[PDB]
Design an enzyme around this catalytic site. Structure first.
Site, PDB file in Angstrom:
ATOM      1  N   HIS A 181      -8.722   2.738  -3.113  1.00 36.90           N
ATOM      2  CA  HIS A 181      -7.625   2.058  -2.406  1.00 36.90           C
ATOM      3  C   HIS A 181      -6.767   1.649  -3.802  1.00 36.90           C
ATOM      4  O   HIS A 181      -6.605   0.243  -3.940  1.00 36.90           O
ATOM      5  CB  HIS A 181      -7.778   1.288  -1.564  1.00 36.90           C
ATOM      6  CG  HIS A 181      -6.236   1.089  -1.002  1.00 36.90           C
ATOM      7  ND1 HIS A 181      -5.119   1.628  -1.235  1.00 36.90           N
ATOM      8  CD2 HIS A 181      -5.704   0.163   0.234  1.00 36.90           C
ATOM      9  CE1 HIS A 181      -4.040   1.107  -0.744  1.00 36.90           C
ATOM     10  NE2 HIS A 181      -4.550   0.151   0.022  1.00 36.90           N
ATOM     11  N   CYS A 228      -1.276   2.573   6.474  1.00 36.60           N
ATOM     12  CA  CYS A 228      -0.946   0.926   6.937  1.00 36.60           C
ATOM     13  C   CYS A 228      -0.513   0.184   5.601  1.00 36.60           C
ATOM     14  O   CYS A 228      -1.021   0.796   4.400  1.00 36.60           O
ATOM     15  CB  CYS A 228      -2.087   0.294   7.555  1.00 36.60           C
ATOM     16  SG  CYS A 228      -3.465  -0.015   6.613  1.00 36.60           S
ATOM     17  N   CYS A 263       0.662  -0.924   0.039  1.00 35.71           N
ATOM     18  CA  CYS A 263       0.111   0.151  -0.071  1.00 35.71           C
ATOM     19  C   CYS A 263       1.007   1.154  -0.070  1.00 35.71           C
ATOM     20  O   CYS A 263       0.497   2.212  -0.685  1.00 35.71           O
ATOM     21  CB  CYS A 263      -0.949  -0.038   1.186  1.00 35.71           C
ATOM     22  SG  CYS A 263      -1.825  -1.577   1.494  1.00 35.71           S
ATOM     23  N   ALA A 277       4.917   6.851   6.852  1.00 33.36           N
ATOM     24  CA  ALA A 277       4.692   8.192   7.440  1.00 33.36           C
ATOM     25  C   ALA A 277       5.496   9.331   6.935  1.00 33.36           C
ATOM     26  O   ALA A 277       6.944   9.021   6.806  1.00 33.36           O
ATOM     27  CB  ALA A 277       4.269   8.395   8.749  1.00 33.36           C
ATOM     28  N   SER A 310       9.510   4.417   7.896  1.00 34.08           N
ATOM     29  CA  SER A 310       8.845   3.385   8.152  1.00 34.08           C
ATOM     30  C   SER A 310       8.767   2.715   9.377  1.00 34.08           C
ATOM     31  O   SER A 310       9.651   3.116  10.247  1.00 34.08           O
ATOM     32  CB  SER A 310       9.285   2.211   7.088  1.00 34.08           C
ATOM     33  OG  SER A 310       9.111   2.737   5.629  1.00 34.08           O
TER      34      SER A 310
END
Lengths: 399, 396, 396, 399
Positions: C351, C381, C89, C389, C277
């Protein structure tokens, strides 16, 4: 009234191993070799043959109406008829009936019957490829199983229906292995001694470096002993009596035959090899399809007015050892027949030589005749069980 | 002493569009619906049926000997016989012959014939999957074409043999589009008029239900036909609209010896008069009917004029126009379209290959019944060339 | 001496529905559209771009090293570098890091990042085709699941790890459907209001054109959400509507050292502040953001309050409700939804796995620009657990 | 400022033949064996490794983010990072860079790099299976070709781009076969003498009847002679100079390495094997991708301040003999470099040992080090061309 029908030419290729000597030869090219052999042996001009009735169990992959392809390539006239028939293991024997009844009724004078199964070259299927799988996994299906060996009515592989026969009549692994051994041994015997040389037409593999020739049946297990048969594990059920050695194999082969009205054979000055006496079907429950011959053999004998003991030689296809021993039992219990092993399957059968499903129905007719000819006998018969139940039997005489 | 053969019950499903309303129903369940319909219309106990002769072009994907499965599910006895037959387009017409010859020779007294093609559910093939591709790309083959519509002898699709007839007889597209239009319009008319409601048994989707033939091009115009591009040859006369369609359908019939029908107290609907095959060169297989129709007529002692109505499948507009003409030149027949294909044919209603051979038989009878006529005939060309034809009479 | 990293151009295609409006456009051509858009918005000559870092989850079917193909077609010089990266993802978010670290260390001055997923065009797999099936049925595998959505470590589909979070925190479906509804409604609102028109580059179909995100469930109601059955577990809280959708999309961005942007006379849009990460157990990979967001904040000397707006992908409604809570219990964060996902997220907009990691970055900036804000962050996630992030600032 | 990075453990499996000794071992299980070997040799607890950067060219068939599967199975903590990188042949060398630059910037202290390619188990693709083929035939695609070896920019197989290099620089079949022979011979030499025993970790095949072990590279052609090389036909072009013997092969392998900041290795009391000096990419036109090393090698040398003659040993992957001879030419013409064959590829390379695409980028780094260690040398370098053009090179020192 109806005509008398005779056979004027007969031929078959060797029975090759699954993915073995003939794996490179597609079904149509085996059919062409067998058909040309039968036509030449009959001494008939292919240009006057009225039709071809082609037998095969797995059409997929072999093109548009393969029998029409096979007929045109062996020189049938474009006016000739063509069709493809399937009755699983009795496909070749039903093609024989369809052609013979056409001759009986005057619809044709000369009919070619081809029976072929190249199980080494059966494709796999993608069922949802047309509309799409949309999402999630699917199955890439072995058509030889899903469209042939796996019977929906039976619930599983043909071997499972043999297990049912063993259970019902209480046939044990020892009895199955004993019978199976003789088939492998008898098959080995006849192969090496050349008993099949007359009926066989060789298949030539056109390799690049060289040119190889297949002229011998290659399924039988060499050096088989009663204790070697006992060493194999069950092939289809836990603790099941059916093994790869006592079960008929997966094999490639093509057989062909030229049929004629008695009067057309005389007009052309040809030699009729034998005369159709009778031929019919008769079913049993799919879950015990193996017992079909026990109901088809008495029926055809009734239609023709023969007694079992009148037949000089029998070719009863052995699909599984338990299946045969079940036929022996049913023939004794519900028929008055004591299967005459001294006049039945002299040179091995499906267990030793293999079981090309689409070709076998006619293969055992071809082998039946040539055994009659080798022994100077007169009256022959051939029968075999069928996946699903609808079994067949046929009777013939050399006049 | 040879037995007389009569038809006691006939049925057929609607002719669905390729990947259309019936795409979700497989061949076997389509055949089961039709067979059950033909059985109850005959009013026979399926437990005494002696055999099933199942016709279809593409067996691939439908299980082990489908006709045996179809028979057992509709209630045939396990002693019954079963077999699958394929003569491409005429498969249904050959299964009929086979069953009728079994009844002629006393081998059976009651034979069920099913003819089905679910072209929406024909699988794709992997020819090298068994032994392995090892290295390099392979082919995922559309069996509908490689094992059916594409003929090696003819060198290409069935549509090329239609183009070959066009060149042989110099048939223009205007004639092709004109014949095609009347086939589409006639189908539309008969569909809306409910003429096919008698022969049809509806297909229930597990809760929608299909009950009308859905192939006819509605609103077809002479000029819409002219704007479509050729489909199989550069500059060819064959288009998707004047060519037969890819479709799904199942037809069934219960045959009997006349003595058995009387013994059981049922009503014979029509009696078999003649049936036969006769081939032409594969490159012009469309001309097949021009040799099969005169043959079966000669076989039966009938002249063409004796037949009150014909069902002659239209594989391609050029093919029919070639059949009309070969019948004129080499036969003494001027094809009477006033007594032929009243309610659309292969072009308008579609060509569900495996079922067509028997489908036209079913449509033939119900048109004879709707018009109070007596003698009917049916014929069709076949991929490869081996065409068939048959003659029937209600005057049992 | 370590270089400052700025983003000069960003673009993204509409988020198409699974097998929907973009099903006909392959991944590479979707990435080419986005990349060309990001390039012209940056106003840089593509001939001087030093590398392309291409993100995608399923490479299968898109040719040899697609990022090299994408780069050459949009005009990168042959000397440029190329590579493909996958963090499921977060693939798009990892490609960003890789390119930004190359610029940080002076390895490159201009790096193009593409992130694409054409889930409508993911092929199926034949695992035994090479060596052969020999005998017996095989599996035709949906790579989207076997090579993506189904995780072996987690024991099943991504939706089971969402159900695992539901059990861990006892999250009911009512909370799941309520969050899902607001995500669907917010997406509908922003789509109709044209908020996504700035970041979007339309996809032209060779002549239709897709230009609006098409996943949001329109007319969604609290009670329509309650009637849908569970999708992955017997009695589970996850449904198709409160779960992220399967979609197609491509996003692209042109990164640069701040000194290069000034030298070339272009306008830096925002500067990279932090990126990292941080993983969690695969069975509860949805909780990833609850460890990645505090880490990148600590890495950058930022407190959560410093960030004006967040783009936190919603993989599953239960997953987000678990992230909201793990952030409360083990971190000191009460997730501020007034400053998070204003215009729908993974549940409402879809997504597109390979593109999401960078897509939320693009959406983050344009929302900062639309609201005149300065500091932004993005996190998500990841299947397997390794979440990411990042933090950015327009105050270069 | 940025940290110094060192390598603490290195390992690779044997290079198996296409559909050969390792055909039964999927890519992830080879990666696990190589990763465990590198981790043990480093003497690091897997529970503290910060991430895994997994290299591979063909993901398809190996599950969701295989590197995360590989990391968890060798005992990485669930907090650790995971990602999968691809740069075709330089995949393993780009994974090395990504991990090292993460260590340079303090983002991680310990990074695992895995590089694997099980080309024997690359699946085939059905592109239209999702939405359906609707009508007509399609293609079942060999992904190893369509998604890897066949370059769209180049127009054909990688071998075609080698033919372009031979054409441009006029390299002949004789020069290609001569170089190729030495690779097969050198590879044979080092294999039988056990030169690769230190770096290799064996792969154990868990057969049912027994347990077999693969410990030796199996690609090199035994008994190769200059006249045997001349007997092979062109493999990719009519009259082309590229053959199966002078072209790198299709092979299975996995390599792994444990990287660390210099200061983290000291804190744990471990032995740093060598220190990253430089590493970078540099592309050439896809149609002559083979010349990539001729532009990457001078570049990395510039970034580090080294001269070519400073490197004690080189591992330059030989994709094709013509490709190498093109690199020698370009390095002489457009660089001032005379490729030192006396300090390059001592024990064979891609032509003799094979070319597992995804693993090779790191394989030659592993082999480079262990050759430095065997010869007591200090400064090593490794470079290789890449499908598409983006080639890589890296420099290392043993302090």
């Amino acid at each position: 009234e109806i005509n008398e029908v005779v056979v004027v030419g007969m031929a078959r290729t060797p029975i090759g191993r699954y993915l073995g000597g003939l794996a490179s030869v597609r079904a149509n090219d085996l059919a062409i070799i067998a058909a040309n052999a039968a036509i030449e042996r009959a001494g008939v001009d292919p240009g006057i043959i009225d039709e071809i009735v082609g037998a095969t169990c797995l059409h997929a992959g072999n093109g548009s109406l393969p029998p029409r392809i096979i007929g045109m390539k062996v020189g049938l006239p474009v006016r000739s008829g063509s069709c493809m028939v399937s009755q699983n293991c009795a496909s070749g024997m039903r093609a024989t009936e369809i052609a013979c009844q056409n001759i009986m009724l005057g619809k044709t004078d000369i009919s070619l019957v081809t029976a072929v199964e190249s199980m080494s070259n059966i494709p796999y299927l993608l069922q949802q490829a047309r509309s799409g799988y949309r999402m999630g996994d699917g199955k890439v299906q072995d058509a030889m199983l899903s469209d042939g060996l796996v019977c929906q009515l039976a619930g599983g592989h043909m071997g499972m229906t043999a297990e049912n026969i063993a259970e019902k009549y209480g046939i044990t692994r020892e009895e199955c292995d004993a019978l199976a051994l003789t088939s492998h041994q008898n098959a080995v015997k006849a192969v090496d001694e050349g008993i099949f040389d007359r009926e066989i037409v060789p298949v030539v593999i056109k390799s690049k470096k060289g040119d190889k020739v297949i002229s011998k049946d290659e399924h039988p297990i060499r050096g088989a002993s009663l204790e070697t048969m006992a060493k194999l594990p069950p092939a289809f059920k836990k603790g099941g009596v059916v093994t790869a050695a006592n079960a008929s194999g997966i094999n490639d082969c093509a057989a062909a035959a030229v049929f004629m009205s008695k009067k057309k054979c005389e007009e052309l000055g040809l030699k009729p090899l034998m005369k159709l006496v009778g031929i019919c079907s008769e079913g049993v429950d799919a879950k015990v399809m193996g017992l079909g011959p026990a109901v088809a053999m008495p029926k055809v004998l009734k239609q023709a007015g023969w007694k079992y003991e009148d037949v000089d030689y029998w070719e009863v296809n052995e699909a599984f050892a338990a299946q045969v021993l079940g036929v022996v039992r049913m023939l004794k219990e519900e028929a008055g027949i004591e299967l005459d092993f001294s006049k039945t399957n002299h040179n091995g059968s499906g267990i030793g030589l293999g079981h090309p499903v689409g070709a076998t129905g006619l293969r055992i007719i071809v082998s039946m005749y040539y055994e009659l000819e080798r022994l100077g006998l007169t009256k022959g018969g051939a029968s075999l069980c069928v996946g699903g139940g609808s079994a067949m039997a046929s009777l013939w005489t050399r006049d």
